[PDB]
RNA sequence: ACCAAACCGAUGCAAACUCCGAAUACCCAGAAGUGCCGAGCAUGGGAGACACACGGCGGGUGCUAACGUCCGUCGUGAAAAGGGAAACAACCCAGACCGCCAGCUAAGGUCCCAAAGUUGUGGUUAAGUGGUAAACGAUGUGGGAAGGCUUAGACAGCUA
RNA sequence: CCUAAAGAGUAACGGAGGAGUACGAAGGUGCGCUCAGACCGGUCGGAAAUCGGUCGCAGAGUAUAAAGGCAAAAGCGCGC
RNA sequence: CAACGGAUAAAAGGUACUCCGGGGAUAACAGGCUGAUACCGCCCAAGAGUUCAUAUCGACGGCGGUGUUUGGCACCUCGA
RNA sequence: GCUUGACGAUCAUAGAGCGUUGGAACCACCUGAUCCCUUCCCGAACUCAGAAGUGAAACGACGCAUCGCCGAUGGUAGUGUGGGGUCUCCCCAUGUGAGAGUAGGUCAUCGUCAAGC
């Protein structure tokens, strides 16, 4: 499932990283977090890009196998080529059982077709945001947060306070007194 | 202790900074070899003009 | 065109850099306003020129509140 | 067309267009986007021409964003005029494009309808483009 | 059911914006060696010159047009022959005191004109591509990572 | 002021603006004090006059363009 | 004395009736470089064509070619 | 060493916000305007004479990261020298290397003197 193999990287810099991408088909990467000194690793380009196609590739914990050592890890950030779109770099956050981790989690809009604002009012559905930033312990990190639009009329706004998170999950942005909009129903363009 | 240094390329058209690095080692013309002590001051002129020289060691 | 005007340059800036030996009356900075402030042993002219009142070397330090930049003279 | 309501200065130096677009290279609002893969500049008549060719093909719902704004004035010297005698007058407004910049966005349509409509828009633009999808990171 | 300052969040741009911020280049001091035997400075005798050109890098202007024009900084020509780029001031290699029917190399080259590999190993091209060219178009051909159907009968054909 | 390439300097019939003054106090010194703006309450004003309170930190001011400065304020007032 | 290092205290024009010394250091003709413009092709396809995008055309936009017009420059020729 | 004052060092990892707490001394509020001194009016502020009251306000001490402020590692951008390309822009070798963001820190640390134990 979510398993990666990586090797230790000892050659650093602009020149060494360019030779990894050009002549070896590898990707530089870093593992930090927990309570340890950070470590520099390297991994296959065609291996990381295959896992990224999975929907829950950023809201799931991954078993990283560096050398023979196995440790549990979550994907924190990801650098991509601005034009071609492939991954150039990635950093990995170590996972500890009792410590809060702050991650991005995708949303799921269900039963959009039965929306009250759609069938009767004839209005469109617009998703203002498609992912939300959460914070929780690893044991209760969800693969997605599910938002329904069954009881939504025309002109109605869905906010962060409206949707409900699983037990032990906190919405970060809502804590800072900012409930940004999630979705709405509006009149047709024409 | 010391190090072989040999001038293999011409000095014509080089940067004035690089001409003084070759002259500071005692090199006069192509295929001419000198003895210079391996000190950080002498190494710095060798590195600045690395492409004009052959360092046998 | 109605643009072809300009004024002659004034040759401002730092005249003596940090660590240089100085003598009394030496001009250190030419300024508009006070980018640098007169530290110990340094006087200020009416066009904000910084000059040396004693002998020593330039120090240049950012200290105090307001984050000001000071030029002072210290004994070598 | 598109141009600033007012500007601090009437003219600008030509400058240079270098680098990649690290900022503005994500699908920030919609689900699909048209992204530039070569460097050039759009003249605010190609932007309007490509917008009308894009919204017409949909004609049923959907939200459309434009992420490029022409804010650089360019001059032109009239015919039969010698060199010098001051800078020329402003004729049109342009936007600098670096490789990897998102040009248009759309949501509320199928992937195939967006893919067909962005093909029509790309035929009015003087630079290479590509079709991309929104991702978390 | 129109418009809506302001505020919150997301998201771009700036030679005459800056919460930031290099590499280089400039000053200063202390040191080893080299310097053609000097390099620096001062004071006097004699000048010439004050129409520059191209190439690279950083810019304004022009159309990021011109063997255009105007600046900064290097190199060459001017005032520099020799070899190479077919011929070709300014490009690359290299700075001619004289002589030799001696040798080694640089850039560039090794089938013939014409000096030197019809050299060796593995592949690609069929277009004289090589030996001029853009949007766009195409079952050309080689390589790679993956997919939708299908022996419970996939696609093309035939027998009603 | 930009061009001007983070020391100085640097051209174009390049891009933008000002000057050919003012002040016997608008100078010296000692002492003393902080603006713009917002909100609330308050008679004719009501958005804005003078007033009281809270926040505010320079978004004000500087004789005159722009740039660089200004808490020991270089800003404001009074006596000599 | 602003033509702001200020020729004198004191100064405007015509020459197709013209003249001399010079210059391709500098224009007009032709040549050269360039190709904004010009001309000729191609790409997209809203639309016109009773219906039907491409029989025939083709808006808004894009990419080239030729030196072929109007230009830009001032490299050759002012002892023709 | 424990508490309070005065003067410094250094200028947010030191600030802001919220809460608890301090009166024996010190300090602050406090009483009065006769006497020095004062208000472009007012003992409000400055000043004088004080010892009835309080720690309310102010100030200090102590806790908390919500804000503010610091902030890696790695990667990316740029860049000196030499060399290349399909040369408006890039790549290679070598040296250098941000800004932003991420993990994460921060409710400061000192010096001299005088008073209470
Ligand atoms: Mg490099
Ligand atoms: Mg050379
Ligand atoms: Mg001008
Ligand atoms: Mg100038
Ligand atoms: Mg200047
Ligand atoms: Mg004085
Ligand atoms: Mg320019
Ligand atoms: Mg940018
Ligand atoms: Mg700038
Ligand atoms: Mg000699
Ligand atoms: Mg002259
Ligand atoms: Mg002279
Ligand atoms: Mg001259
Ligand atoms: Mg000249
Ligand atoms: Mg010149
Ligand atoms: Mg020249
Ligand atoms: Mg140039
Ligand atoms: Mg130029
Ligand atoms: Mg040119
Ligand atoms: Mg020229
Ligand atoms: Mg040059
Ligand atoms: Mg030169
Ligand atoms: Mg020479
Ligand atoms: Mg000459
Ligand atoms: Mg020659
Ligand atoms: Mg030759
Ligand atoms: Mg020859
Ligand atoms: Mg040739
Ligand atoms: Mg060779
Ligand atoms: Mg032969
Ligand atoms: Mg053979
Ligand atoms: Mg072969
Ligand atoms: Mg051929
Ligand atoms: Mg051919
Ligand atoms: Mg400068
Ligand atoms: Mg410089
Ligand atoms: Mg000059
Ligand atoms: Mg004027
Ligand atoms: Mg004043
Ligand atoms: Mg100012
Ligand atoms: Mg003060
Ligand atoms: Mg004159
Ligand atoms: Mg004059
Ligand atoms: Mg004169
Ligand atoms: Mg006359
Ligand atoms: Mg004559
Ligand atoms: Mg004559
Ligand atoms: Mg000529
Ligand atoms: Mg002339
Ligand atoms: Mg003719
Ligand atoms: Mg002509
Ligand atoms: Mg053309
Ligand atoms: Mg029709
Ligand atoms: Mg041509
Ligand atoms: Mg012709
Ligand atoms: Mg010329
Ligand atoms: Mg001729
Ligand atoms: Mg003639
Ligand atoms: Mg003749
Ligand atoms: Mg780093
Ligand atoms: Mg950093
Ligand atoms: Mg920061």
From Swiss-Prot, chain A:
Top-level taxon: Bacteria
- State the CDD domains in the record: Ribosomal_L25_TL5_CTC
Q: What would you give as a GO molecular function for this chain, any one? A: 5S rRNA binding
Q: Which UniProt keywords apply?
A: Ribonucleoprotein, Ribosomal protein, RNA-binding, rRNA-binding
Stored Pfam families? Ribosomal_L25p (PF01386), Ribosomal_TL5_C (PF14693)
**What cellular component terms from Gene Ontology apply here?**
cytosolic large ribosomal subunit
Q: Which family does it belong to?
A: Belongs to the bacterial ribosomal protein bL25 family. CTC subfamily.
- Quaternary state and interactors: Part of the 50S ribosomal subunit; part of the 5S rRNA/L5/L18/L25 subcomplex. Contacts the 5S rRNA. Binds to the 5S rRNA independently of L5 and L18.
Q: What is this protein called?
A: Large ribosomal subunit protein bL25
Swiss-Prot record, chain B:
Keyword list (alphabetical) reads: Ribonucleoprotein, Ribosomal protein
Q: Which GO terms describe its biological process?
A: translation
Q: Which domain of life is it from?
A: Bacteria
Q: Which CDD domains match?
A: Ribosomal_L30
Pfam families hit by this protein: Ribosomal_L30
State any GO CC term.
cytosolic large ribosomal subunit
A single Gene Ontology MF term assigned here is: structural constituent of ribosome
Q: Where are the transmembrane segments?
A: none
Q: Is Ribonucleoprotein given among the entry's keywords? A: yes
Task: List the InterPro entries hit by this protein, alphabetically.
Answer: Ribo_uL30_ferredoxin-like_sf, Ribosomal_uL30_bac-type, Ribosomal_uL30_ferredoxin-like
The UniProt entry, under PANTHER family, shows: LARGE RIBOSOMAL SUBUNIT PROTEIN UL30M, MITOCHONDRIAL RIBOSOMAL PROTEIN L30
Cross-referenced HAMAP family, in alphabetical order?
Ribosomal_uL30_B
Member of which family? Belongs to the universal ribosomal protein uL30 family.
Q: How does it assemble?
A: Part of the 50S ribosomal subunit.
Q: What is this protein called?
A: Large ribosomal subunit protein uL30
- Species the sequence originates in: Pseudomonas aeruginosa (strain ATCC 15692 / DSM 22644 / CIP 104116 / JCM 14847 / LMG 12228 / 1C / PRS 101 / PAO1)
Source lineage: Bacteria, Pseudomonadati, Pseudomonadota, Gammaproteobacteria, Pseudomonadales
Gene name of the record: rpmD
Swiss-Prot record, chain C:
Q: Which domain of life is it from?
A: Bacteria
Q: From which residue to which does any coiled coil extend? A: none
Q: Which GO terms describe its cellular component?
A: cytosolic large ribosomal subunit
The record's listing under SUPFAM superfamilies reads: Ribosomal L27 protein-like
Q: Does the keyword Ribonucleoprotein apply?
A: yes
Any one GO MF annotation of this record: structural constituent of ribosome
- Could you tell me the Gene Ontology terms of the biological process aspect for this record? translation
Q: Please verify whether the record's keywords include Ribosomal protein.
A: yes
The record's Pfam families line, in alphabetical order, gives: Ribosomal_L27
Keywords from the UniProt entry: Ribonucleoprotein, Ribosomal protein
Family membership noted in the UniProt record: Belongs to the bacterial ribosomal protein bL27 family.
Protein name per the record: Large ribosomal subunit protein bL27
According to its UniProt entry, this protein's organism is Pseudomonas aeruginosa (strain ATCC 15692 / DSM 22644 / CIP 104116 / JCM 14847 / LMG 12228 / 1C / PRS 101 / PAO1)
UniProtKB/Swiss-Prot annotation, chain D:
Q: Which GO terms describe its biological process?
A: translation
Q: Does the keyword tRNA-binding apply?
A: yes
Membrane-spanning residues where? Answer: none
Membrane: present as a keyword of the record? Answer: no
Q: Which CDD domains match?
A: Ribosomal_L16_L10e (cd01433)
Q: Keywords for this entry?
A: Ribonucleoprotein, Ribosomal protein, RNA-binding, rRNA-binding, tRNA-binding
Q: What is this protein called?
A: Large ribosomal subunit protein uL16
Q: How does it assemble?
A: Part of the 50S ribosomal subunit.
Please report which protein family the annotation says this sequence is part of.
Answer: Belongs to the universal ribosomal protein uL16 family.
Q: Report the InterPro entries cross-referenced here.
A: Ribosomal_uL16, Ribosomal_uL16_bact-type, Ribosomal_uL16_CS, Ribosomal_uL16_dom, Ribosomal_uL16_sf
